[PDB]
């Protein structure tokens, strides 16, 4: 995702 | 009559005398921030704020909290934002977030402006709140890296972004979290955070002590291999990796 802190 | 407190996991809490249904509705309630001494306090319904005036805890006696309103006419209430609306009053700061950070020029260099703390404090200590329009990770992830420098994923279903302009404090001051850069070895991390204004956001946190003017860092933690990331960071990851 081009997000921060996402949790993969 | 008893009083009651009810704290979120990071800290902060509603506190007063229920309602016959064991609800935080009254003239009397407030809500604490995790430092156990800031407080927005008046009307709430149901745990909502209404009319939050600013305050300083002062004192418990028998578990009531006696409160000192603040000067000034600082108001708050519940507001969380929309797609397209950040805030109400994008210029009225948050009166904890205030007290611990300011921002200025990057100590990183090429990084712009980044995020300061003002004073002293210890580990695990919330220091700034990341709010933002709430937008899906469809919208975000189908757009490019140019227009996703402020996105920060909240949970499987939101991101949280501030769109230019409101990525400039004169536009936009109200939370400044977005300030935060990056680093890979960070003195922060984000955690969630139940805002009375902002509603569910995230929060930054310390990891460690921090000093007077430390610039606070957080891993942005974008995907190494899916890298989905901007060169910047492509860049400095590879440095990152060559230290270890
Ligand atoms: N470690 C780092 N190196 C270079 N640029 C960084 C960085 N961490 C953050 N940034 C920059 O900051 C942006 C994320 S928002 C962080 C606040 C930003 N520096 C500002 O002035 O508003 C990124 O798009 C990138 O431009």
């Given at each position: 995702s081009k997000s921060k802190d996402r949790k993969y | 009559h008893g009083v009651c407190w009810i704290y979120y996991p990071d800290g902060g809490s509603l506190v007063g005398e229920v309602n016959?249904?064991?609800?935080?509705?009254?003239?009397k309630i407030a809500y604490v921030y995790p430092d156990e001494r800031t407080a927005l306090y008046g009307k709430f319904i149901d745990g909502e704020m209404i009319e939050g005036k600013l305050a300083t805890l002062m004192s418990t006696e028998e578990g009531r909290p006696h409160f000192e309103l603040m000067p000034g006419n600082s108001v708050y209430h519940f507001d969380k934002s929309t797609s397209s609306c950040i805030?109400?009053?994008?210029?009225?700061?948050?009166p904890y977030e205030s007290e611990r950070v300011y921002v200025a020029?990057?100590?990183?260099?090429?990084?712009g402006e980044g995020l300061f703390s003002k004073v002293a404090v210890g580990p695990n200590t919330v220091m700034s709140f990341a709010n933002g329009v709430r937008i899906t990770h469809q919208e975000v992830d189908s757009r490019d890296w140019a227009l996703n420098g402020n996105t920060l994923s909240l949970d499987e279903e939101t991101v949280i972004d501030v769109p230019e302009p409101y990525n400039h404090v004169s536009k936009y001051?109200?939370?400044?979290?977005?300030?935060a850069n990056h680093s890979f070895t960070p003195n922060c991390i984000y955690d969630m955070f139940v805002h009375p204004?902002?509603?569910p956001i995230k929060c930054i946190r310390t990891l460690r002590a921090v000093e007077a003017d430390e610039e606070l860092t957080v891993?942005?933690?974008?995907?190494?291999?899916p890298p989905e990331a901007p060169e910047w960071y492509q860049v400095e990851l590879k440095a990152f990796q060559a230290t270890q």
């Open positions: - | 016959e249904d064991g609800e935080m509705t009254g003239e805030s109400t009053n994008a210029l009225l700061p948050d020029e990057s100590l990183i260099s090429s990084a001051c109200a939370s400044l979290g977005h300030k204004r902002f509603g891993a942005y933690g974008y995907d190494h291999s």
